[PDB]
Amino acid sequence: MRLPDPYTNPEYPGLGFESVNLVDNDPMIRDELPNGKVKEVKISAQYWGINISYPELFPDEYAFLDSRLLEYKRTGDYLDVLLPQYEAFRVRGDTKSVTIPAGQKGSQIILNTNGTLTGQPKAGDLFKLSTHPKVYKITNFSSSGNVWNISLYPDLFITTTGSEKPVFNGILFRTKLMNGDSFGSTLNNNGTYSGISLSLRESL
């Protein structure tokens, strides 16, 4: 399920994201030895945290947003969040004729584009596999012919089976709405709803 944004629903301009906050949550156990050497240990997973802020909402905008959020809380679905700043179209073509060799469980994807894709991905962009909902950021990219060497920040959450297909454009965060236990919005005497905030967390 998609969170309402002024792409799908421009008739409600108040539903735009006044300010997004992409939080990097990678819990680690960091210990500082007296000999000046700082040591880290990583066990848990990394999850992208998204915080959405909203302006004053008119009754119709709030009605639409609240209906969507209550539909989410009813069906127990997953809110999809689209960040416009990450929607630069660089890689274009078909992602079905590209092959990803299997057995890749590290933090690096080696894929043979088979010359079917034009353009090259840029470092810091958003990358995602077609068979897993986790979202990756490209930290480095080296192309030697048709084989690409894409480096990702989160260690690969799945081991490639050889059937996965890279996804570069149209990437959505399969988030789950936090702070929904006590979710409310105050209605002022002037008819507009205020104090609406969405603390979302990537529940892959």
Binding site: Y7, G14, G16, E18, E56, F58, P84, Q85, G191
Partner: peptide, 22 residues
Amino acid sequence: WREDRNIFDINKIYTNKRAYVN
């Protein structure tokens, strides 16, 4: 005026559209 300038209006000129009576 209810300013609803958001991140989807980056690189664009924003014009106020909706208002409420105080």
